[PDB]
Amino acid sequence: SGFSF
Amino acid sequence: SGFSF
Amino acid sequence: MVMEKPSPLLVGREFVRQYYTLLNQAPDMLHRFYGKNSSYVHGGLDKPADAVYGQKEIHRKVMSQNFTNCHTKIRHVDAHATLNDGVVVQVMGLLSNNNQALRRFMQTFVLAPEGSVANKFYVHNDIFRYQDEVF
Amino acid sequence: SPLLVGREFVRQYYTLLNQAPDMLHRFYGKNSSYVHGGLDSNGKPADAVYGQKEIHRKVMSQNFTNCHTKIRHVDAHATLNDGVVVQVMGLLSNNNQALRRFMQTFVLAPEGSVANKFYVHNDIFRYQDEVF
C-alpha cells in the first residue's frame, strides 16, 4: 500500500 | 536520444 | 482546507522522515511501505547481497537484521520527479544499530503512486549500502 | 537484464565523461534532471538543472578535463515502466586532482522509439566530502 502524505 | 543496448 | 499538490522534494523528505522513524520504533511495520513488485537490499555476506521482492520476503529480511535502538543522522536528501509521476530519492547519512558503530551510507528510494487513493506513494525500490563494506 | 544494462551504462557514462564530456548531453531528454555536487554562496549543495539544453550547459561549465574514475560498486534494479535504477559508488578525479569519493543515482528510462534504447531521466551526483 505505502504511506499517506 | 540516449545510450543503446 | 485543500493544499496544492506537493513537490517531489517534499514527498521525498517526509517519506525519509517516516521511514527511519518507523525503523527505530516499529521496524516490523516497515513492510507496509512495499508491494508485490518492490525490491529491497542491504548487503553484508559473505559478494555483497541480492535483492528480495514482495511484502513477505522484505518483512522477513527486515526482521533478520534486528533494528533495535536505531539512530540515523540524515545529512542530505535528494528527491526528483522521475518517470510517470514517480519520485526518486537519494539519501546520504549516518546509521547506528544495536548501540554499535555509527556507519556512513547511501540509500536510493523509488516512490510510485499506489494508483488507488489521494496522492499516496509506496516504495518500489529500496537500495541501502554501507560505505565501509565498499570503500 | 537490468543489472547488465545499468552496469554497461556506467562504463559508457564515465568513459565518455573522460574522453568527450561535450558529447555527454545526448544521454538526456527535455525532462531529465542533473546535479553534480557543488555548494552555494551559503555553503550548501547546489540545485539541479533540467533538460538536455541546460544539462549540457552545466557540464561544459564544470570543465571536465582528464576525468578519472574507480567504480567500486554498481547495483542496478528494475523500476516502474520498464525503467532501471543504478546506484553508483566510487571515486572521481577532475583536472588531475585527488580522487574524491561519491554517491550517485541514475534512472534509466526506455527511449520509446528504438528497441533497447535508454536515456537518463535522472542523474544525482554528490561528493561525500561536501556532505559529510
Author numbering:
A (entry chain D), B (entry chain C): 2 to 6
C (entry chain B): 1 to 46, 50 to 138
D (entry chain A): 7 to 138
Show me the paper's own sentences about this structure:
Ras GTPase Activating Protein SH3 Domain Binding Protein (G3BP), a 52 kDa protein highly overexpressed in various cancer tumors, has in the last couple of years proved to be a significant cancer marker protein and a potential drug target. G3BP is involved in several cellular functions and is implicated for example in stress granule assembly, RNA metabolism and hereby cell motility, nuclear transportation and NFkappaB, Ras and Wnt signaling. In addition to the PxxP motifs, G3BP also contains glutamine- and glycine rich regions, an RNA recognition motif (RRM) and an N-terminal NTF2-like domain ranging from residue 11–134 in human G3BP1. The NTF2-like domain forms a homo-dimer with each molecule composed of three alpha helices (αI–III) lined up against a beta sheet made up by five beta strands (βI–V).
Co-crystallization of G3BP1 1–139 with the FxFG peptide under the same conditions as for G3BP1 1–139 alone resulted in long needle-like crystals that differed significantly in morphology from the rectangular crystals obtained for the unliganded form of G3BP1 1–139. Electron density corresponding to the FxFG peptide was unambiguously located in a hydrophobic pocket between helices αI and αII in chain A and chain B, and residues 2–5 (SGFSF) of the peptide was subsequently modeled and included in refinement. All residues, 1–139, were modeled in chain A, while residues 47–49 remain disordered in chain B. Thus, more residues could be modeled in the peptide complex than in the unliganded structure. This suggests that the NTF2-like domain and in particular loops VI and VII become more ordered upon binding of the peptide. Apart from this, no major changes in backbone and side chain conformations are observed, and an all-atom superposition of the unliganded structure and the ligand bound form provides a calculated rmsd of 0.44 Å. The peptide adapts a β-strand conformation, where the N-terminal phenylalanine, Phe4, from the FxFG motif is held in place by G3BP through parallel-displaced pi-stacking with Phe15 and Phe124, and T-shaped pi-packing with Phe33 from G3BP1. The second phenylalanine, Phe6, in the peptide forms hydrophobic contacts to Leu10, Val11 and the Cβ and Cγ atoms of Glu14. In addition to the hydrophobic interactions, four hydrogen bonds from the backbone of the peptide to G3BP1 exist. Interestingly, the glycine residue contained in the FxFG repeat could not be modeled into electron density, suggesting that it may mainly be important to provide structural flexibility and not as a contributor of binding energy. Especially, the orientation of Phe4 is highly conserved between peptide chains C and D, indicating that this residue is highly important.
